[PDB]
Enzyme design. Structure first.
Site, PDB file in Angstrom:
ATOM      1  CD  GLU A   1      -2.652  -1.158   2.569  1.00  0.00           C
ATOM      2  OE1 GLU A   1      -2.237  -1.760   3.584  1.00  0.00           O
ATOM      3  OE2 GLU A   1      -3.742  -0.552   2.541  1.00  0.00           O
TER       4      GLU A   1
ATOM      5  CE  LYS B   1      -8.566  -8.194   6.210  1.00  0.00           C
ATOM      6  NZ  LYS B   1      -7.538  -7.133   6.124  1.00  0.00           N
TER       7      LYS B   1
ATOM      8  CB  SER C   1      -5.077  -1.571  -0.787  1.00  0.00           C
ATOM      9  OG  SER C   1      -4.960  -0.355  -0.071  1.00  0.00           O
TER      10      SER C   1
ATOM     11  CD  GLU D   1     -12.999 -12.765   6.528  1.00  0.00           C
ATOM     12  OE1 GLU D   1     -14.022 -12.243   6.027  1.00  0.00           O
ATOM     13  OE2 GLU D   1     -12.028 -12.081   6.924  1.00  0.00           O
TER      14      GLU D   1
ATOM     15  NE  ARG E   1     -27.910  -2.142   1.284  1.00  0.00           N
ATOM     16  CZ  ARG E   1     -28.876  -1.323   1.705  1.00  0.00           C
ATOM     17  NH1 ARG E   1     -29.976  -1.802   2.279  1.00  0.00           N
ATOM     18  NH2 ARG E   1     -28.749  -0.014   1.540  1.00  0.00           N
TER      19      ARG E   1
ATOM     20  CE1 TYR F   1      -6.393   1.181  -2.808  1.00  0.00           C
ATOM     21  CE2 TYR F   1      -7.225   3.303  -1.948  1.00  0.00           C
ATOM     22  CZ  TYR F   1      -6.828   1.971  -1.737  1.00  0.00           C
ATOM     23  OH  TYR F   1      -6.872   1.426  -0.485  1.00  0.00           O
TER      24      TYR F   1
ATOM     25  NE  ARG G   1     -12.519   3.360   5.742  1.00  0.00           N
ATOM     26  CZ  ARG G   1     -11.651   2.449   5.324  1.00  0.00           C
ATOM     27  NH1 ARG G   1     -11.915   1.144   5.384  1.00  0.00           N
ATOM     28  NH2 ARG G   1     -10.524   2.874   4.792  1.00  0.00           N
TER      29      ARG G   1
ATOM     30  CG  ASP H   1     -14.134  -1.536   6.225  1.00  0.00           C
ATOM     31  OD1 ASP H   1     -14.348  -0.311   6.384  1.00  0.00           O
ATOM     32  OD2 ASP H   1     -13.160  -1.958   5.553  1.00  0.00           O
TER      33      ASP H   1
ATOM     34  CD  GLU I   1      -9.958  -4.361   7.280  1.00  0.00           C
ATOM     35  OE1 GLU I   1      -8.894  -4.816   7.770  1.00  0.00           O
ATOM     36  OE2 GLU I   1      -9.977  -3.698   6.224  1.00  0.00           O
TER      37      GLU I   1
ATOM     38  CG  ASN J   1      -8.721  -0.709   7.748  1.00  0.00           C
ATOM     39  OD1 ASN J   1      -7.835  -1.562   7.706  1.00  0.00           O
ATOM     40  ND2 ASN J   1      -9.838  -0.805   7.037  1.00  0.00           N
TER      41      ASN J   1
ATOM     42  N   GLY K   1      -7.318   5.150   4.590  1.00  0.00           N
ATOM     43  CA  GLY K   1      -6.921   6.002   3.484  1.00  0.00           C
ATOM     44  C   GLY K   1      -7.497   7.399   3.509  1.00  0.00           C
TER      45      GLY K   1
HETATM   46  N1  LIG Z   1     -16.770 -12.605   4.100  1.00  0.00           N
HETATM   47  C1  LIG Z   1     -16.992 -11.839   2.976  1.00  0.00           C
HETATM   48  N2  LIG Z   1     -18.181 -11.885   2.338  1.00  0.00           N
HETATM   49  C2  LIG Z   1     -18.420 -11.149   1.244  1.00  0.00           C
HETATM   50  N3  LIG Z   1     -17.491 -10.336   0.730  1.00  0.00           N
HETATM   51  C3  LIG Z   1     -16.273 -10.222   1.301  1.00  0.00           C
HETATM   52  C4  LIG Z   1     -15.977 -10.985   2.467  1.00  0.00           C
HETATM   53  N4  LIG Z   1     -14.719 -10.690   2.824  1.00  0.00           N
HETATM   54  C5  LIG Z   1     -14.226  -9.828   1.989  1.00  0.00           C
HETATM   55  N5  LIG Z   1     -15.133  -9.502   1.026  1.00  0.00           N
HETATM   56  C6  LIG Z   1     -14.929  -8.556  -0.110  1.00  0.00           C
HETATM   57  O1  LIG Z   1     -13.498  -8.306  -0.328  1.00  0.00           O
HETATM   58  C7  LIG Z   1     -13.155  -6.969   0.168  1.00  0.00           C
HETATM   59  C8  LIG Z   1     -12.000  -7.041   1.183  1.00  0.00           C
HETATM   60  O2  LIG Z   1     -12.251  -6.079   2.228  1.00  0.00           O
HETATM   61  P1  LIG Z   1     -11.182  -6.196   3.426  1.00  0.00           P
HETATM   62  O3  LIG Z   1     -11.805  -5.010   4.384  1.00  0.00           O
HETATM   63  O4  LIG Z   1     -11.485  -7.592   3.895  1.00  0.00           O
HETATM   64  O5  LIG Z   1      -9.871  -5.925   2.580  1.00  0.00           O
HETATM   65  P2  LIG Z   1      -8.963  -4.733   3.214  1.00  0.00           P
HETATM   66  O6  LIG Z   1      -7.768  -4.775   2.133  1.00  0.00           O
HETATM   67  O7  LIG Z   1      -8.622  -5.375   4.516  1.00  0.00           O
HETATM   68  O8  LIG Z   1     -10.023  -3.559   3.168  1.00  0.00           O
HETATM   69  P3  LIG Z   1      -9.235  -2.126   3.346  1.00  0.00           P
HETATM   70  O9  LIG Z   1      -8.709  -1.963   1.966  1.00  0.00           O
HETATM   71  O10 LIG Z   1     -10.456  -1.274   3.816  1.00  0.00           O
HETATM   72  O11 LIG Z   1      -8.093  -2.553   4.430  1.00  0.00           O
HETATM   73  C9  LIG Z   1     -14.437  -6.394   0.807  1.00  0.00           C
HETATM   74  O12 LIG Z   1     -14.535  -4.984   0.593  1.00  0.00           O
HETATM   75  C10 LIG Z   1     -15.564  -7.201   0.158  1.00  0.00           C
HETATM   76  O13 LIG Z   1     -16.026  -6.582  -1.049  1.00  0.00           O
END
Ligand SMILES: Nc1ncnc2c1ncn2[C@@H]1O[C@H](COP(=O)(O)OP(=O)(O)OP(=O)(O)O)[C@@H](O)[C@H]1O
Ligand SMILES: Nc1ncnc2c1ncn2[C@@H]1O[C@H](COP(=O)(O)OP(=O)(O)OP(=O)(O)O)[C@@H](O)[C@H]1O
Lengths: 319, 319
Positions: free
Chosen positions: A13, A116, A159, A189, A196, A229, A268, A270, A282, A284, A288
């Site tokens: 990142e 995670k 990211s 997972e 949503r 991005y 933030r 999620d 998670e 953060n 960003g």
């Molecule tokens: N258990 C799940 N069920 C459905 N979709 C999922 C699941 N886990 C991850 N995703 C999808 O993949 C993406 C990964 O988000 P995640 O917050 O897990 O990655 P991140 O790189 O940790 O996010 P950020 O970039 O905010 O750190 C999510 O935004 C979602 O669209």
């Protein structure tokens, strides 16, 4: 008041961190100097740090760690390094020993929210709903107690780097190997379909103030790097188009999670809305601040403008 | 092959750390130099560091953080700093950014095993049995959902510092006031009376190998500071007089806990045995190596002598 902004990092990142630095430097209401950690671990100072910002990437640095920078002329340090060696407690640790007040979460909170597996373990114990998962280590056979579709992610990412949507049990071994290129541990997972994505910003030291809930919608397999991005790809819906009752429950679980993990400064959170049921994804600690980022847009809709949000972060560092 | 041993620290275990430095320097099979962090946070290098070792304590140091130490001369760094700013991920964080291989747990595991609240939260979720407990933040009124006796402790403590056995509720406030001198968070645990204390050493990275189980016997209210460090007060029964299946469960629980928290290098896992039930007390990532410490003795009973234990530790840092 003089602030030092650290951006870049050795994590995937790195480029996101530099884009986040653009957003912060343009809006911070205090005299701020930038310091860039290039991809090789070496630092860039002064004018060379500003030139690296225009390039959107900085592969090679000048100064080996610890940098010969004058820490005493800075009241607060702002670490804006996402991912491994920046948001995971390492830089926070260095700053704790230096005795310099800094923005964001401490060592433990940063280390927890970036793993995670461990963050979900703390949250599940606190009574916060999380997606059912299992942790898989490198060299250890994958024992998954549930059936596909999966979501394989490296335990330390941001990211969406190294994240894959697995449909068949056959595709698990290849997605885990992609995940193992970024961490020695990965999470498997359960994929929620349809889903949503709800995101809420928090501000404060341990006991936080929530921002309005926002929603992210897209036209891609999942919310990946490209969708995150490249301009216009993601639909940032602030406020979130849902029932006012579940909008309050998102804010409550966010603030509860923030307190349990002992987060300072910002985060933030999620969330996942799947068939009426709410699940926490998670937290953060250093989110960003890119032109397509959710955190500052959430607080902008809450009456807290961009210069004010950054000013509140600098104030929380000192208290 | 040259090792840098860092001992001392700003924590209440500064003296215990220097005693641990005497134990490692006497048995380590590699040419080792010592660096001492004094009680003021300033570092003592070279000859001033070896003189600090003979004086029992180092109140004042010479060099402010970061020290003008020649890091390139060392292959492995051995942080032997017990407690806050040493065992909590702060020093591990600095060493990570330095690109220096070091002994023991990384940032995350170090921060978690030091926090008596967060470690128990992660462990209870994993299914490991722990004593009923509650966390209390400074200034906030306590809410203890169980009957006395209790054990009140600062969340980041070691060497029994700031720990009180509370008999009546009239004494809770004074015990919390003592605990809050060392941390901003305290834990109140249900006291097990009577209780047997079992200790087991672990060696390895994530998937560790357990040492035989040892039981601590003493004649004092609890295993306090003076019982821990005064010669002959703390008796070690190695192998512990347990049932066939119980000795196995202790080792299995220690390895499960170690794997979950992702601990590297070493850990001494302490347990409690009350009315046939086992409870995990805590994991210590940098246990003592003092003349009365249990970790090296737990391993010499398992065929791993003192120089070999330290050889394994230095080697695991590079694995
Ligand atoms: N258990 C799940 N069920 C459905 N979709 C999922 C699941 N886990 C991850 N995703 C999808 O993949 C993406 C990964 O988000 P995640 O917050 O897990 O990655 P991140 O790189 O940790 O996010 P950020 O970039 O905010 O750190 C999510 O935004 C979602 O669209
Ligand atoms: N829940 C409990 N029930 C009974 N006794 C307890 C309990 N908690 C702590 N004690 C007593 O207090 C001692 C120290 O507690 P703890 O093991 O948590 O201190 P420490 O400072 O963390 O130990 P170390 O010195 O190994 O770091 C124990 O060895 C035990 O004798």
């Amino acid at each position: 008041m003089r602030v030092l902004l650290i951006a870049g990092g050795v994590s995937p990142e790195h480029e996101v961190s530099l884009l986040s630095a653009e957003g912060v430097l343009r809006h911070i209401p205090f005299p701020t100097d930038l310091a860039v950690i290039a991809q090789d671990g070496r630092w860039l100072l002064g004018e060379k740090a500003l030139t690296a910002l225009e390039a959107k990437a900085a592969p090679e640095g000048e100064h080996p760690f610890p940098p010969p920078l004058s820490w005493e002329r800075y009241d607060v340090v702002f670490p804006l390094l996402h991912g491994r060696f920046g948001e995971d407690g390492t830089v926070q640790g260095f700053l704790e020993l230096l005795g310099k007040p800094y923005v964001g979460a401490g060592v433990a909170a940063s280390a927890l929210c970036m793993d995670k597996d461990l963050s979900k373990r703390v949250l599940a114990q606190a009574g916060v709903p999380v997606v059912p998962w299992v942790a898989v280590r490198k060299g250890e056979p994958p024992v998954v107690p549930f059936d596909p579709p999966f979501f394989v992610k490296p335990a330390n990412t941001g990211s969406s780097v190294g994240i894959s949507r697995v449909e068949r049990f056959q595709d698990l071994e290849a997605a885990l190997a992609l995940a193992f290129r970024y961490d020695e541990k990965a999470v498997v997972e359960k994929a929620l379909s349809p889903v949503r994505e709800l995101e809420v910003g928090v501000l404060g030291n341990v006991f936080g103030e929530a921002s309005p809930v926002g929603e992210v919608r897209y036209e891609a397999p999942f919310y990946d790097y490209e969708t995150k991005y490249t301009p216009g790809r993601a639909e940032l819906l602030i406020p979130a188009p849902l029932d006012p009752g579940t909008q309050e429950t998102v804010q409550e679980l966010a603030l509860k999670a923030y307190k349990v993990l002992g987060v300072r400064g910002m985060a933030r959170v999620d969330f996942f809305l799947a068939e009426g049921e709410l699940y926490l994804n998670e937290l953060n600690t250093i989110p960003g601040f890119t032109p397509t980022s959710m955190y500052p847009r959430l607080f902008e809709a809450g009456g807290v403008a961009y210069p004010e949000l950054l000013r509140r972060l600098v104030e929380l560092a000192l208290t």
